[PDB]
Structures are given as structure tokens and as C-alpha cells.
Symmetry: D2
Subunit: 115 residues, 4 copies
Amino acid sequence: CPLMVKVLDAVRGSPAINVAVHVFRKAADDTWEPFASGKTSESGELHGHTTEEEFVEGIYKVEIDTKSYWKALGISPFHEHAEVVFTANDSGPRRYTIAALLSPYSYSTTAVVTN
Amino acid sequence: CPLMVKVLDAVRGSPAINVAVHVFRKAADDTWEPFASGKTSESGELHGHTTEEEFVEGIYKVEIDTKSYWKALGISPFHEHAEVVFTANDSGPRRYTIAALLSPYSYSTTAVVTN
Amino acid sequence: CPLMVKVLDAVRGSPAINVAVHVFRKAADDTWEPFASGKTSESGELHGHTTEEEFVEGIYKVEIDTKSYWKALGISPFHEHAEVVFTANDSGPRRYTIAALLSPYSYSTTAVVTN
Amino acid sequence: CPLMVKVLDAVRGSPAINVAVHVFRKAADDTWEPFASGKTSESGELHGHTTEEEFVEGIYKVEIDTKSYWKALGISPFHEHAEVVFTANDSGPRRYTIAALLSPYSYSTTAVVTN
């Protein structure tokens, strides 16, 4: 899998489990189009999305349903969701890991791009 | 100024100056309508393009043009922009400060909401 | 105020109020000597206990009592405190703002240095 | 291994490789005492420190030589190092992962505690 998403909960000090993640690729009309989606596992990971075949260069959007996650915990959140928009540039045979750290009123996201 | 945006550069330890910010409000037809925009000052702050009257409840999107900022500094960043989407004032009027901390392959964003 | 400390609560989306902060300066004998201390205000800021004359170059340590803060809110946090250690003014006098963003199992800290 | 340290570089979008990490445990005299140390691997991880035998409850300090890491890259950093001080509380048979995200003028750290 060329694109991995890892979500952490900065409140409980745990993986963020059962979080819905939708991945989209930018299409000609500059409209978003579904690409991949799933729920994070107990390790907080959303795994084997697409293969290296369909993971072409382009603009991708990763949308993390943070709001539903916090509501499930009884915690009042600020964000409607977390969005990560980036360019996949084809250079070395690279894996992208999108990491997200969640708190009710803040999140951070980091890309780890490895050979 | 019920909506303030503050942007910091985590690489230089400075305010992120001259960063473009666009604010959208979700309209009735579920599309995004332009609400306010500006560039951060020398103190990394974007102030009042918005009044308290005009800043009614709704879903807002703050999009920070992080890519142009890194590129103008000779850096090729991961993300296209930083997006912050939230519901505003739905329990009455609040002041919101959206803080963003920028690195080339990482950003974080935090909301400070005061009465 | 050449040394300012600002602390935010990522759980409540608010300034972190009444947070204890201790600043130490490394002395000649390689131990830490007490330099300044205070509690954050309602705006989450700790201001001037320091003058520009007294804030000479050296290695400084800013220790933020995050544990007492979470516990006073009914929360059992991971960390004992947040520590920030840095060399100050070694190319002439600067203004430093140390920003800390707090969650129970996570914190981040950022330095903004201006001339 | 009951305690893992994972370090990321928010500048290059990579694991932070070859970073020196020193772990200390709080001793009776309220002095720090060496516990474990090593260099992060190419995956940015410092692995199999101690066993569950010697990883008892107590106050631990993880010190990450961020300054040497940035100097090796030609990047001028703010921090002397990053320090993470926490309490290991013995409850479920738990693994602690200490994650650190580094930028020249900022870092964040998160604990992921898992069964």
C-alpha cells in the first residue's frame, strides 16, 4: 500500500480507533472524486487503500471524520473534520504515511515519505 | 474582529508573514461561498475583514495558502494548503482565533474560542 | 518583556489559565539557577518577571507545570511537566515567545524569536 | 520492549534517523539516573530499550538530542534538546510509545499507551 493513514488520540494517549477516513483524488473538473476510504483499525491505521497502480501523481485529499470520533467519546469538538490536501509527486518508489494527532480543539498532521 | 487567524513558521521561529488566507461559509445549496480573505501581517496575524453582524452561525472554512508561502522561501512543501472547517456561533456569538503552526511536511492548527 | 510564555488548552479551546511556569538559567557550575516564575493569566500568558538587562545570554529552561493544570481539571495526564531548553541572546538581544499547546497525552511547544 | 521512542522530521517529511536518545529514571535523591539510550534507526525508532522487568513504575525522562540532529542537516535549531518527562503507572500490561515530531523551532510529543 502506497498510502497509509495513522490517527492518534492526544486526549486518551491511544490510537484513534474506528475513525472514518475518505480519500479523494483531484479530477479534471477540479472536482473531488472518491479514491479510497475505510475505518481505522485498533492500531489507529487505515491500511492497504490502493495499489501503486492506481496511486498515480496528482492532488489528493484525506478527510478524517474527527467530529464523529469525539462525539462517540462524549467530547465536544471544534472541527467538522480534519482535511489533508497534498501533491503526490512520483520520484523514488515512495510510501506516504499521513499521520494525524487529534485533540477536541486542535489537530496536527504530518507526512512521512519513505523510499 | 470575531475571527482572527494567526500563522507561525516552525522552521524560522517567526510569524509567517504575507500568507494568503481565504475564509468560506457553507451556503444553503451546500456549496462554499467566499466570506473573507487577506494576507497575514508582519506579526503573522490576519485581522478584521469580518464584522460581528456579518459573522453569523454556520459552517466556516479557513484555507491557508501554505504552499505559496513555502515556495516563496525556496521550499517544496508536502501540503497544498492548510484547511480548517468548523461550525461557528451556534450557541451565540464567540471570538475565534485560529492558530496554525507551519512546517514543510507538517502543520498543526488550534482554535481558541472566548466569550 | 523579552521572554513571554503563552499556554493553550487543546481540549477546551481556551487559554490555559493559572498554569505555573518556572524559568531557570544554567549557572557556571552546570546547575540550574531560578531565574523567574509566575502563573499564566486569563489570556494564557505569562509576562515580565524579567528585564532586558537581566535576560543575558545563556542556556534557559522553561518548565510548565502541565500536571497540576490537568489534575485541577479532573484529568490524569501523561507528562509531569513540559520543559523547553534553549540558548538565548547569543547573537545579541532578542524577544522570545514560548508557545505551548496542551493535551492530556500530548503537548507541543514553539518559539517565536523577533528582533 | 515496554518503551519505544519514535522520532519524525517535519522538515524533510521523514523519520529522524541517527538521533541520540537518553532515557533516565527518577531515583530516591530526586536525581536522574541513566536507564537506557541509543540512536534512532532508519525508521526513526529507538527500540528494545529495557524489558518489562526493569521497566518499573516511576518517573522517566526521555531526552532527544534534537540540536545535533539539526546541525547535521545544516539547520539552525532553537532547542538544546527535547525532553519528555512522564509517570509510568503500572495498570494493564502496557507498552508506551513516545512519539516526537521535530522542526527547528518547534516540537511536539505524544504518548501512545497500548494494552
